[PDB]
Scaffold this active site. Structure first.
Site, PDB file in Angstrom:
ATOM      1  N   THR A   8       8.944   2.826  -5.477  1.00 14.21           N
ATOM      2  CA  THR A   8       8.399   4.145  -6.134  1.00 14.21           C
ATOM      3  C   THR A   8       7.305   3.915  -7.052  1.00 14.21           C
ATOM      4  O   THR A   8       7.491   3.011  -7.950  1.00 14.21           O
ATOM      5  CB  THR A   8       9.699   4.748  -6.888  1.00 14.21           C
ATOM      6  OG1 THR A   8      10.821   4.820  -5.730  1.00 14.21           O
ATOM      7  CG2 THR A   8       9.447   6.407  -7.195  1.00 14.21           C
ATOM      8  N   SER A   9       6.184   4.892  -7.161  1.00 14.92           N
ATOM      9  CA  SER A   9       5.432   4.863  -8.150  1.00 14.92           C
ATOM     10  C   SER A   9       5.089   6.189  -8.564  1.00 14.92           C
ATOM     11  O   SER A   9       4.630   7.011  -7.966  1.00 14.92           O
ATOM     12  CB  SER A   9       4.090   4.253  -7.249  1.00 14.92           C
ATOM     13  OG  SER A   9       4.120   2.766  -7.367  1.00 14.92           O
ATOM     14  N   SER A  58       9.419   1.113  -9.435  1.00 13.56           N
ATOM     15  CA  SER A  58       9.122  -0.252  -9.194  1.00 13.56           C
ATOM     16  C   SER A  58       7.553  -0.664  -9.272  1.00 13.56           C
ATOM     17  O   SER A  58       6.917  -1.690  -9.539  1.00 13.56           O
ATOM     18  CB  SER A  58       9.824  -0.654  -7.676  1.00 13.56           C
ATOM     19  OG  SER A  58       9.133   0.207  -6.668  1.00 13.56           O
ATOM     20  N   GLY A  59       6.860   0.091  -8.647  1.00  9.65           N
ATOM     21  CA  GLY A  59       5.424  -0.059  -8.498  1.00  9.65           C
ATOM     22  C   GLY A  59       4.436   0.196  -9.829  1.00  9.65           C
ATOM     23  O   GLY A  59       3.308  -0.522  -9.938  1.00  9.65           O
ATOM     24  N   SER A  87       6.635   1.124  -2.781  1.00  5.04           N
ATOM     25  CA  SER A  87       5.495   2.126  -2.732  1.00  5.04           C
ATOM     26  C   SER A  87       4.851   2.460  -1.688  1.00  5.04           C
ATOM     27  O   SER A  87       4.501   1.328  -0.970  1.00  5.04           O
ATOM     28  CB  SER A  87       4.905   2.306  -3.960  1.00  5.04           C
ATOM     29  OG  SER A  87       5.966   2.122  -5.218  1.00  5.04           O
TER      30      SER A  87
END
Lengths: 196, 204, 244, 222, 243, 233, 198, 244, 250
Positions: free
Chosen positions: A1-2, A129-130, A169
């Site tokens: 996820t970004s 996370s990104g 991502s």
């Protein structure tokens, strides 16, 4: 996820990738992580998909009840409702929510809500996370009071790098623009952002 | 550790030409120790027959529960319970205890009194309806029964011929299972009459 | 507050009587007469239907004679809706006993339980009592054929022959006159029909105005069988006795 | 288990296999995985079979009551919202993974729901153990603005990929077509490519083979 | 025995007097209101009366914004009006959250009428002495008028009227729809539908209005809104250039 | 008229009166007289105790709430016990949670709200006791008059009970005198003893009849009875 | 676990229960009566968890005696055993289950036949000619399967239990300090005081 | 018949709630209180009847603060007014907890309105014997409200309730006519003192104390503060000058 | 707050009469006439749509309601009381039956469930009885076609043909003369229109009369095809045009 949200001259733009994964398998490559809770108040979602969807649905309910009685809520008010659910149910929730909305008086505002349930008002915020891979890039390239053209490019270049390094991502870069003119949906495909 | 493997036992059901058959072993045990050779696992409420495997305390409890519910049904409806409807009653009763389930493998068998249609059904411990036209198996020798029934079974068997099929499927599956055996009983269900036969088998 | 509107259903009169119980018993005396007779080889239940029409479907009708158990049945006098509430709880209670002891519930235990529920509404709750009088007809391996009756107060008594509803004083006198201890069911069937026909407020006692049931142990079976009579079966037995 | 959902120009189609397993052993060779929420909204279940059946019937019951209360045709978003909020409350303990699709006064819809209560929206979706085999076919042959017949062929091919390649799937293909202006057609056993070949020997026993100890007649009549 | 007119229990005649007296409380404010349907809109007109000079005119309102789509005008005391307003808003928000779509006008009306029925049956909750007229443009039914009363009764209207002089407005509207033969007001713009509603308010009541004498609520596609004093003034200039 | 609206406290009269509250106030006037007064340094309670027989003990009128607060009762003693116990808990809560001595003004607010809840709900009755609360906090000496209606008033001097108007007229006349009695406890007691004697009619104040309490700047709330009040007779 | 044995002969039900109570390292008692009289013609023996074993037995005793007073009637051995089974079935899914294994030894006065019931802590009832709980059956069942007849006298049944106890006293590692033997027939419940050297 | 005024939630034949109208009589009997809306804030003022010289001046505070920006003043049963303010403070804290922003005045007005209206729905509760004048400064300007025992409230340019409400309203109406552009915060405090002194003529038998509070955007930074010291004395002198 | 009406509002009078039930039955008598007729192959239930205003749309107010796909209901008396009972009747069909047995309840049992709710409104604290009588028409596999009447007391009776409301006495007498055990569904509708004409004063057409039938299964009204056992609902509300066609052959 970004996910990210950046305030600028005319308002605020929210940005996100479209990848949700179950381990190493991409269950959905066209996900919309930019969720509306009010006409000109939106949120970016990271962490548990089931948690963030349930929170956003309750916030949208609270803000609809608020508008019926008191009128259009502020971005701070929307961030407060998000926080109240995140903080009080911290043991059962895994949610990293960026709250960004437009006001006629307050212009553009960004509030980040990490895992614990705290509120942080920022000019811009990155999560997911990104986001770890673009902390250096965003800190060096972010300027205050940028134009719409500049802010779109800033988010496009940031999330492209976030997608490049992070396996969680990917997909397309989705953007929601919040100004006095209204709400604008933007999309950028892999053939464009990968070669930046 | 496994509550469905403490007592042991097997139930098998089969369809035929205008008839159904349901069979079970008579063994009740406590792990390796054999306790009883008279523990029947087939029960009936009117014309609908129910075979229950698994934990024996739940077998007795559910039998008393379904007798409780079919008696109240008969008083209210002014008619006997039907195989299709009873199948749904078992399913809803089992799912009612979703997070604290009865460790059982229920099997419904019978013929609809109005249409004359042969009907069999199967359930897991939480109440999933397994509606097969051929055969339903349950118990500690379920694998052994699946292999027997898939090989021996053929559609539209006569009551006398279906008896031979279900009996041989039960006996040879029970002989390959440590927790099954100690006698066997077969029911032959017809529209008008039901024949109960006790089988001669190994007692070890 | 609400004190102003409280009728006070659970209080004694200066005489020592319960207002709502006495007024409920007055309501029963208007309802159709139900008669039960206990014989040596079975029990007879007969009841007169209150308010009947030509277009009333009798074949699907049940207002007075209800089945509680395979061995126990009731005759209803009073409010039909209030009776069905109690009849349902009695059906659950009978099945609770069967689940617990693996034996059919003895008649008296079922009667006492229903009568205790009636008593509850008389002492506490502030609610109106059940305007129902039951006649219990049942069989168990202890006492054999049994006949009980219970009223809104929650009091129950055992009987050889009893009547509830309208004209009970007249009906009980007729029953006491012709009853003997060595009666047969066929004789008891006749007495029940003769007593109703003499106490009927209507012109004539016909089949469409009656509910009939017999509880007998079959000589060619060895088990007790309940028989709720069909409209045609009531018509047949009405001619056989000499009423037509 | 292999379940798919494909959107076409004037509606939506769902398909499933018919294999039910208890571990490595097949329990049912021809089970119905296509469930009905309401006349025009259908559901495909994966995971815990008892959970998928019960959650469909519970929400389906509430949808029927809602439809009669509002005097309106059931909506897919209504069935979706009631399913996700129920599954979220139980925190994934109810193992129901569903693909819900249907038509209503607002149009055609296709959604997928996980056990924890998360929902996804797309034109082509797949769930179950044969999901990756099905998605592979879907990612290769899917195009925008599909016709009815093309959607049936695409969904059925995706399910077949589950049958042949995934061990958790097999037997037959069940299809349900949901068009905007027409009634939903449920096609039970649309394809049967796994017919059992005739046995080499008949195992019919001669009468009197099994030894009987005691024989009696069971009383049914009360 | 004589307390049958004090609580919601049946009288010997089979009537409920507490409900009947709650109907009488609706005319306490002495305010008339009407509702009409356009081609793709719904308009509510309510009389605005400010007796005290110390009052703030902007706060004196009997038209409420329940949701984005649904609006409500109330005939009766304002304490009970705001009680029904808050509840309707809460019911509207809950429906959207539970069922994923905006609550229809008729469904909210049925819900509020069901609650009003409870106060008619149960003793401790008194009936609200108000009549509620719900208006919107439904995504399925189009322009909608649904009215609820203290009895728990509700029904759909082509056009409705409420107040002390209700019958004067009702018969005035009746005679128009007998003449036009159609069930709605055949006009494209909502502005002229508001103009129609004001004209027929004047013709029936026999009274001229100023910008502060009226209160207008307009329901369109995906939006309900109330007009300001200057918006009504603009509408009053248009009808003056006709008569 | 009065008979129809005095059934319970929840009912209003046509004139807007609450008769159940008014009857509770009547219980104070039937009760024995007690006087409260203060200066800038000290606060004094003087109470006249009542006995049933000459063989009975004199019922106590003054109750200690905290080391810096106390009150005198007039009316129903059990109702005074309930309200004083609540005030004991409120003083205790402030000292344990906030390490703070409860303000006498805030103590009056707490007694006001508790008495009010008995006047608006069905089934409840108003308290049948009047209370005179004295105390020394961070703002000096205080005296508060509590009424069953909920009305609490801060006063320099006051008296409640039977014949209490005589004492109230005295304190209103002597207002400028007893207010300036600073740093002298004994003279403030004598001003209260002379106040309560203005309410006497049946008998004279004796050794086991008089009850006096005092709280001040360097004086914790202490109650004097019997031999300790003999020097003021 | 403790020794709990039961045998149904022609006219009576015989129960044999061990006398030893062991807690940790010491035998605290060698004369404990591990049985309770539920009704004049029904006896119940018990073994299991230290506290639960007596608490459950006295609870059942209180309920049967309550029934006997209310109805002025003695419940059949079948009706009593079904009541006990349901209580243990309710207990197994409660917060803290009764870990008690019971044997119901009763004489039905209506049927004129002895009856023996075996119910474990889970609630598993079975009517048996002979029964045992725990490890007791492992040593005894083979002797019972060999010698048992349905027409056996009370004297014959006592001789078979003697043989069963002798096998337990030889092969089983635990010292259960002998057994208390009780007879349940048409005349009621009596105790065999002479089993130590019968 | 009669007896419609005995119970609270009961409707009278003419559609009225007499118990609420009876609570209004308690307000009319009470002390006169006022509220004046100025160009950037609101000014509250209350009469304080001096019963005896024994009452300590400037101690028995009647005007109460809710949150940090709302001021409340009421007439009638003082304890009932405190109960409403206690609820108002709970409701304001609940709003700030969830929405972060301090509660708007129109938002706060409804919270009190719904609560007072709730006390007219049941026979187990008594209607409030207070009319509360309240207001403050929020996001968009100043607001002034007056709440009735029925639950009814409106926005006001000037509010008046209590004993001398007629004299107060008449003087408030003159201010609206003479100042259409808007009165200032300094002028409103001075005027509030004048209104009470003229309204005291209705209760001129007893001496009285003046208590004024205000909440202005430019004068008090939008916070509720009590008028103390020189500004309070300046108001008294202005009122004492125009009383003669 | 808190319900203090924990006592019965319906009590026995000295004469034995339950006042609130009798007064509720009186409210039914004032209500508009509704009727029901059972034929060999169906059941018909009909009523007059008494419009309060010509401006009000009579389509939005349904006096005849679907309970289950095989069971319908009509009333006489208090409209609001009927509407809430239908909501409860629809819910109890699922909660007490369909979620247990996987199928819809038979007419007699659903009637019994509605009757229980109405009985409780007679005995429970702080409530009044329902001011309505209901006519419930339905079909099930084992009982066939049936018609039931449910009264405010909670009592229910099976009927061949009956009427409730204003001219119920006159309508029942007319039904007694025309009813036979060999009537077809189309014949039963014909008598229904004839009996209702005597009660209706004003306009008698498909817009003023509400009529529904319990007859054959409707596969076109099911909404889906595929399952052979699912053949469609037996309840069908007749449209304004369908009523007008049968009024021409009156």
């Amino acid at each position: 996820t970004s996910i990210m949200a950046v305030t600028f001259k005319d308002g605020v733009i929210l940005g996100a990738d479209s990848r949700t994964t179950t381990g190493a398998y991409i269950a959905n490559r066209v996900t919309d992580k930019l969720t509306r809770v009010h006409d000109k108040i939106w949120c970016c979602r990271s962490g548990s998909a089931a948690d963030t969807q349930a929170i956003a649905d309750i916030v949208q309910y609270h803000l609809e009840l608020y508008t019926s009685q008191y009128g259009t809520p502020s971005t701070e008010t929307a961030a407060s409702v998000f926080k109240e659910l995140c903080y009080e149910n911290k043991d059962n929730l895994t949610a990293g929510i960026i709250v960004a909305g437009y006001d006629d008086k307050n212009k553009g505002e960004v509030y980040t809500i990490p895992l614990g349930g705290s509120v942080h008002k920022l000019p811009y915020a990155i999560a997911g996370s990104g986001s770890t891979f673009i902390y250096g890039y965003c800190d060096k390239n972010f300027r205050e009071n940028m134009s719409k053209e500049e802010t779109v490019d800033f988010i496009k270049h940031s999330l492209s790098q976030a997608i490049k390094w992070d396996g969680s991502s990917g997909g397309v870069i989705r953007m929601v623009v919040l100004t006095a003119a209204g709400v604008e949906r933007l999309i950028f495909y892999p053939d464009e952002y990968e070669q930046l | 550790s496994d509550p469905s493997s403490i007592n042991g036992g097997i139930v098998v059901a089969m369809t035929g030409k205008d008839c159904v058959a349901i069979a079970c072993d008579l063994r009740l045990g406590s792990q390796s120790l054999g306790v009883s050779n008279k523990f029947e696992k087939i029960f009936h409420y009117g014309h609908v027959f129910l075979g229950i495997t698994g934990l024996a305390t739940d077998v007795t409890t559910l039998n008393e529960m379904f007798r409780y519910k079919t008696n109240l049904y008969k008083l209210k409806e002014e008619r006997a319970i039907e195989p299709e409807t009873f199948t749904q009653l078992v399913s809803s009763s089992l799912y009612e205890r979703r997070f604290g389930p009865y460790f059982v493998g229920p099997v419904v068998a019978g013929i609809n009194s109005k249409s004359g249609k042969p009907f069999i059904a199967g359930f897991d411990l939480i109440g999933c309806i397994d509606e097969a036209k051929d055969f339903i198996v349950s118990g500690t020798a379920s694998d052994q029964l699946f292999g027997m029934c898939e090989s021996l079974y053929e559609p539209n068997l006569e009551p006398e011929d279906l008896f031979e099929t279900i009996s041989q499927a039960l006996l040879n599956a029970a002989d390959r299972d440590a927790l099954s055996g100690w006698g066997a009983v077969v029911y032959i269900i017809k529209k008008d009459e039901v024949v109960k036969r006790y089988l001669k088998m190994r007692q070890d | 507050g609400s004190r102003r509107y409280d009728s006070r259903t659970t209080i004694f009169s200066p005489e020592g009587r319960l207002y709502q119980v006495e007024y409920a018993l007055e309501s029963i005396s208007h309802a159709g007469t139900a008669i039960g007779i206990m014989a040596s080889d079975g029990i007879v239940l007969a009841a007169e239907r209150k308010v009947t029409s030509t277009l009333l479907e009798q074949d699907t009708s049940t207002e007075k004679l209800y089945k509680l158990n395979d061995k126990i049945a009731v005759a209803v006098a009073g409010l039909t809706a209030d009776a069905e509430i109690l009849i349902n709880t009695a059906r659950i209670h009978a099945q609770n006993y069967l689940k617990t002891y693996n034996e059919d519930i003895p008649v008296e235990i079922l009667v006492r339980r229903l009568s205790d529920i009636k008593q509850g509404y008389t002492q506490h709750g502030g609610l109106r009592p059940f305007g129902v009088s039951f006649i219990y007809a049942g069989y168990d391996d202890r006492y054999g054929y049994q006949l009980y009756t219970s009223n809104p107060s929650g009091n129950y008594t055992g009987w050889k022959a009893i009547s509830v509803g309208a004209n009970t004083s007249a009906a009980q006198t007729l029953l006491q006159m012709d009853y003997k201890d060595d009666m047969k069911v066929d004789d008891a069937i006749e007495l029940a029909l003769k007593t109703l026909s003499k106490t009927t407020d209507s012109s004539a006692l016909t089949y469409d105005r009656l509910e009939f049931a017999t509880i007998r142990k079959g000589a060619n079976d060895g088990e007790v069988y309940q028989k709720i009579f069909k409209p045609q079966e009531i018509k047949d037995i009405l001619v056989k006795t000499g009423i037509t | 288990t292999t379940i798919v959902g494909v959107k076409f120009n004037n509606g939506v189609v769902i398909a499933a296999d018919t294999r039910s397993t208890q571990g490595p052993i097949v329990a049912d060779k021809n089970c119905a995985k296509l469930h009905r929420i309401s006349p025009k909204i259908w559901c495909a279940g994966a995971g815990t079979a008892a959970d998928t059946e019960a959650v469909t019937q519970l929400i389906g019951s509430n949808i029927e009551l809602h439809s009669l209360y509002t005097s309106r045709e059931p909506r897919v978003v209504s069935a979706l919202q009631m399913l996700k909020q129920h599954l979220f409350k139980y925190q994934g303990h109810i193992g129901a993974y569903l693909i819900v699709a249907g038509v209503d006064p607002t149009g055609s819809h296709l959604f997928s729901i996980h056990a924890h209560g998360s929902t996804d929206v797309g034109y082509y979706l797949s769930l179950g153990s044969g999901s990756l085999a099905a998605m592979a076919v879907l990612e290769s042959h899917w195009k925008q603005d599909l016709t009815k017949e093309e959607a049936i062929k695409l969904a059925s091919d995706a399910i077949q990929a589950g049958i042949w390649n995934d061990l958790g799937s097999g037997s037959n293909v069940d299809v349900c077509v949901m068009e905007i202006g027409k009634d939903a057609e449920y096609l039970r056993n649309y394809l049967t490519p796994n017919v059992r070949e005739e046995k080499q020997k008949s195992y019919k026993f001669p009468r009197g083979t099994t030894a009987v100890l005691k024989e009696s007649i069971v009383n049914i009549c009360d | 025995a004589g307390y049958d007119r004090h609580i919601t229990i049946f009288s010997p005649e089979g009537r409920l007097y507490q409900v009947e007296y709650a109907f009488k409380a609706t005319n306490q404010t002495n305010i008339n209101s009407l509702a009409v349907r356009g081609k793709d809109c719904t308009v509510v007109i309510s009389q605005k009366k400010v007796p005290d000079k110390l009052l703030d005119p902007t706060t004196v309102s009997y038209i409420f914004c329940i949701s984005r789509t649904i609006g409500m005008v109330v005939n009766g005391p304002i304490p009970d009006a705001r009680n029904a307003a808050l509840r309707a808003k809460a019911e509207a928000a809950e429906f959207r959250y539970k069922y994923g779509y905006d609550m229809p006008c008729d469904v909210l009306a049925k819900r509020m009428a069901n609650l009003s029925q409870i106060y008619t049956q149960r003793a401790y909750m008194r009936p609200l002495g108000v009549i509620l007229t719900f208006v919107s443009v439904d995504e399925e039914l189009g322009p909608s008028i649904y009215k609820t009363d203290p009895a728990g009764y509700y029904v759909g209207y082509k056009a409705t009227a409420t107040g002390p002089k209700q019958q004067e407005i009702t018969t005035n509207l009746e005679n128009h729809f007998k003449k036009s033969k159609i069930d709605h007001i055949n006009e494209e713009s909502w502005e002229k539908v508001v103009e129609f509603a004001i004209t027929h308010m004047i013709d029936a009541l026999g009274t001229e209005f100023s910008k502060n004498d009226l209160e207008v609520g307009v329901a369109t596609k995906d939006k309900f809104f109330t007009l300001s004093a200057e918006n009504i003034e603009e509408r009053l200039v248009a009808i003056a250039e006709q008569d | 008229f009065r008979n129809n609206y005095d059934g319970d406290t929840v009912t209003f009269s046509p004139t807007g009166r609450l008769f159940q509250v008014e009857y509770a106030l009547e219980a104070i006037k039937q009760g024995s007289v007690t006087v409260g007064l203060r200066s800038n340094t000290h606060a004094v309670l003087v109470a006249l105790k009542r006995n049933a027989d000459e063989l009975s003990s004199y019922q106590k009128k003054i109750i200690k709430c905290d080391e810096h607060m106390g009150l005198s009762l007039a009316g129903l003693a059990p109702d005074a016990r309930v309200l004083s116990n609540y005030l004991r808990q409120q003083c205790n809560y402030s000292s344990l949670v906030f390490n703070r001595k409860l303000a006498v003004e805030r103590a009056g607010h707490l007694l006001c709200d508790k008495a009010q809840k008995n006047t608006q709900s069905y089934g409840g009755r108003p308290y049948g006791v009047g209370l005179l609360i004295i105390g020394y906090d961070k703002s000096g000496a205080h005296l508060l008059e509590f009424q069953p209606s909920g009305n609490v008033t801060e006063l320099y001097g006051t008296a409640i009970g039977a014949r209490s108007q005589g004492a109230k007229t005295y304190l209103e006349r002597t207002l400028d005198t007893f207010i300036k009695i600073d740093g002298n406890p004994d003279e403030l007691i004598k001003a209260g003893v002379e106040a309560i004697s203005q309410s006497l009619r049946d008998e004279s104040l004796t050794v086991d009849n008089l009850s006096i309490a005092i709280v001040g700047k360097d004086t914790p709330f202490t109650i004097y009875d019997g031999e300790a009040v003999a020097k003021y007779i | 676990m403790d020794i709990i044995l039961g045998i149904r002969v022609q006219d009576s039900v015989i129960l044999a229960s061990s006398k030893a109570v062991t807690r940790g390292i010491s035998v605290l008692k060698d004369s404990d009566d591990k049985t309770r009289q539920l009704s004049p013609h029904t006896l119940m023996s018990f073994a299991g968890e230290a506290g639960d074993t007596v608490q459950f037995a006295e609870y059942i005793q209180a309920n049967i005696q309550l029934y006997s007073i209310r109805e002025d009637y003695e419940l059949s051995p079948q009706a009593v055993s079904s009541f006990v089974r349901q209580e243990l079935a309710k207990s197994i899914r409660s917060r803290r289950p009764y870990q008690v294994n019971v044997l119901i030894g009763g004489y039905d006065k209506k049927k004129n036949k002895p009856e023996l019931y075996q119910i474990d802590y889970l609630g598993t009832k079975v009517e048996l000619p002979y029964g045992a709980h725990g490890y007791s059956g492992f040593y005894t069942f083979s002797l019972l399967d060999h010698h048992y007849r349905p027409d056996m006298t009370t004297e014959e049944g006592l001789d078979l239990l003697k043989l069963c106890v002798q096998e337990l006293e030889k092969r089983m590692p635990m010292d259960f300090k002998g057994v208390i033997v009780k007879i349940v027939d048409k005349d009621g419940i009596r105790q065999v005081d002479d089993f130590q050297a019968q | 018949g009669t007896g419609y005024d005995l119970s609270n939630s009961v409707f009278s034949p003419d559609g009225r709630n007499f118990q609420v109208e009876y609570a209004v009589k308690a307000v009319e009997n009470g002390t006169t209180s006022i509220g004046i809306k100025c160009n950037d804030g609101v000014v509250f003022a209350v009469e304080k009847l001096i019963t005896s010289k024994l009452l300590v001046p400037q101690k028995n505070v009647k005007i109460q603060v809710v949150d940090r920006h709302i001021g409340c003043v009421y007439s009638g049963l003082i304890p009932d007014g405190r109960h409403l303010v206690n609820r108002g403070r709970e409701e304001a804290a609940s709003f700030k907890k969830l929405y972060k922003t301090p509660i708007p005045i129109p938002a706060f007005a409804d919270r009190l309105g719904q609560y007072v209206q709730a006390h007219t729905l049941y026979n187990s509760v008594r209607p409030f014997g207070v009319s509360t004048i309240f207001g403050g400064v929020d996001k968009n300007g100043a607001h002034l409200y007056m709440l009735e025992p029925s639950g009814s409230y409106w926005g006001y340019k000037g509010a008046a309730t209590g004993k001398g409400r007629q004299s107060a309203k008449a003087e408030l109406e003159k201010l609206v006519d003479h100042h259409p552009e808007g009165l200032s915060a300094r002028e409103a405090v001075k005027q509030a003192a004048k209104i009470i002194y003229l309204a005291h003529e209705d209760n001129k038998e007893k001496d009285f104390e003046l208590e004024i509070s205000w909440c202005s955007l430019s004068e008090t930074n939008g916070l509720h503060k009590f008028v103390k010291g020189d500004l309070l004395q300046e108001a008294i002198d202005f009122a004492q000058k125009e009383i003669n | 707050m808190t319900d203090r009406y924990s006592f019965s509002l319906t009590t026995f009078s000295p004469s034995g009469k339950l006042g609130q039930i009798d007064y509720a039955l009186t409210a039914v008598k004032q209500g508009v006439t509704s009727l029901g007729i059972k034929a060999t192959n169906g059941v018909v239930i009909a009523t007059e749509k008494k419009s309060s205003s010509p401006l009000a749309m009579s389509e939005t107010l349904s006096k005849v309601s679907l309970l289950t796909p095989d069971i319908g209901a009509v009333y006489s008396g208090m409209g609001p009381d009927y509407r809430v009972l239908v909501d409860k009747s629809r819910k109890v069909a699922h909660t007490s039956y369909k979620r247990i047995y996987g199928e819809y309840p038979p007419t007699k049992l659903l009637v019994s469930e509605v009757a229980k709710i109405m009985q409780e409104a007679t005995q429970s604290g702080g409530v009044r009885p329902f001011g309505v009588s209901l006519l419930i028409a339905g079909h099930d596999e084992f009982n066939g076609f049936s018609l039931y009447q449910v009264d405010p007391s909670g009592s229910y009776f099976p009927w061949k043909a009956t009427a409730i409301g204003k001219g119920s006495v006159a309508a029942k007498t007319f039904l007694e003369k025309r009813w036979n055990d060999e009537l077809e569904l189309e014949d039963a509708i014909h008598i229904a229109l004839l009996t209702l004409k005597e009660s209706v004063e004003g306009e008698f057409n498909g817009d003023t009369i509400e009529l529904a039938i319990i007859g054959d299964e409707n596969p076109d009204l099911l909404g889906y095809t595929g399952i052979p056992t699912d053949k469609g609902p037996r309840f069908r509300k007749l449209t304004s045009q369908e009523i007008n066609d049968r009024l021409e052959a009156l």
